[PDB]
Amino acid sequence: PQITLWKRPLVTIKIGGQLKEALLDTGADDTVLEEMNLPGRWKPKMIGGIGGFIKVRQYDQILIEICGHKAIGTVLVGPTPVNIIGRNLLTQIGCTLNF
Amino acid sequence: PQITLWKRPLVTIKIGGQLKEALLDTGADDTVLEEMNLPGRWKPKMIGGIGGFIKVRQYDQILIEICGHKAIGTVLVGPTPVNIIGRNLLTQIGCTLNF
Numbered sequence: 258p259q260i261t262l263w264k265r266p267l268v269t270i271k272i273g274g275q276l277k278e279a280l281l282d283t284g285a286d287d288t289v290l291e292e293m294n295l296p297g298r299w300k301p302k303m304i305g306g307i308g309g310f311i312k313v314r315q316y317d318q319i320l321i322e323i324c325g326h327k328a329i330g331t332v333l334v335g336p337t338p339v340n341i342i343g344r345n346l347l348t349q350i351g352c353t354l355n356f
Numbered sequence: 357p358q359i360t361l362w363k364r365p366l367v368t369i370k371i372g373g374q375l376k377e378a379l380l381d382t383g384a385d386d387t388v389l390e391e392m393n394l395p396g397r398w399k400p401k402m403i404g405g406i407g408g409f410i411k412v413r414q415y416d417q418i419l420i421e422i423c424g425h426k427a428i429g430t431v432l433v434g435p436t437p438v439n440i441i442g443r444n445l446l447t448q449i450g451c452t453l454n455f
């Protein structure tokens with residue numbers, strides 16, 4: 258579809274067998290999701306933005322479905338205030354900016 | 357144009373007569389630029405991101421040209437890790453997400 262930017266671009270995603278709301282975020286290199294107890298191994302990581310860094314758990318080869326579009330890649334889990342879909346997955350669903 | 361997301365969506369902007377590079381950021385409500393001298397009045401504001409809140413200077417009704425497209429609106433100035441163009445100006449230049 259086409260998403261205007263008057264409001265936050267929030268969509269439904271499916272991950273680890275759960276549905277959630279997440280921001281389609283062209284300023285996010287990586288995908289960062291709210292605390293959730295995903296199975297499997299993970300690597301510690303720190304990601305930075307406005308205000309500083311947070312500590313997150315990096316899980317690899319995670320399947321996420323975004324508005325029916327499937328994607329698989331790296332997902333970071335940590336105390337983010339919002340579920341964020343970053344470019345690593347946005348590219349995979351064919352998402353572009355257009356003006 | 358149509359901008360893909362394999363790399364960061366960086367563009368040249370012109371503000372207060374100066375050229376700079378900035379990130380088109382659909383996850384940003386507001387536009388935040390690194391410390392710089394802008395003419396006119398400003399008021400202190402706080403904004404929050406992934407790592408907490410920072411103090412910024414709020415400039416209203418500022419002219420800014422984004423990849424050839426003119427906007428006039430609110431620009432925050434402060435210790436952001438990178439210059440970001442948020443939805444308040446993305447809307448003005450007619451930017452949408454498409455997949």
Ligand SMILES: CCOP(=O)(COc1ccc(C[C@H](NC(=O)O[C@H]2CO[C@H]3OCC[C@H]32)[C@H](O)CN(CC(CC)CC)S(=O)(=O)c2ccc3ncsc3c2)cc1)OCC
Nearest residue numbers: 284285286287304305306307338383384385386404405406
């Ligand atoms: C409301 C909940 O609480 P809250 O008020 C704000 O919550 C939010 C927290 C984060 C966002 C998303 C964030 N937007 C943001 O900073 O926007 C500011 C400006 O406009 C306002 O609108 C929303 C907030 C205000 C960017 O889109 C993405 N970021 C990178 C950019 C940093 C400038 C480029 C470096 S990233 O997230 O840091 C990030 C993501 C993946 C990644 N992979 C490797 S690095 C790395 C870094 C949106 C809302 O904060 C109090 C705790």
